[PDB]
Amino acid sequence: MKELVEMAVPENLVGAILGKGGKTLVEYQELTGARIQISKKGEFLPGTRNRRVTITGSPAATQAAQYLISQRVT
């Protein structure tokens, strides 16, 4: 069983998630086995300046990746 988690990441912190070169985003995927994607390098959520991050995989994989990203959201 697989699921999709969608979370918000303020535009001024996204450089944190990527880590530059995508290094971190690749590592988090690597460690968890969850696929992680960040919204259009131009568009955000609602009356938002938060980009949308989509995480897919097993519930446990998805939760470990959301958690690890959350630690870096300042």
Task: Answer yes or no: are the C-beta atoms of 9 and 69 closer than 8 Å.
Answer: yes
Residue type (1 letter), 47: G
Q: Indicate the burial class of 70 (C-beta count within 10 angstroms; 0-12, 13-18, 19 or more).
A: exposed
Cβ neighbourhood burial of 36 (10 Å; 0-12, 13-18, 19+): buried
CATH of the domain at 14: 3.30.1370.10
**Number of domains forming the structure of the chain:** 1
Alpha-carbon dihedral sign for residues 62, 9, 70, 32: positive
Identify how the structure was determined: X-ray
Which domain range does residue 51 map to? 1-74
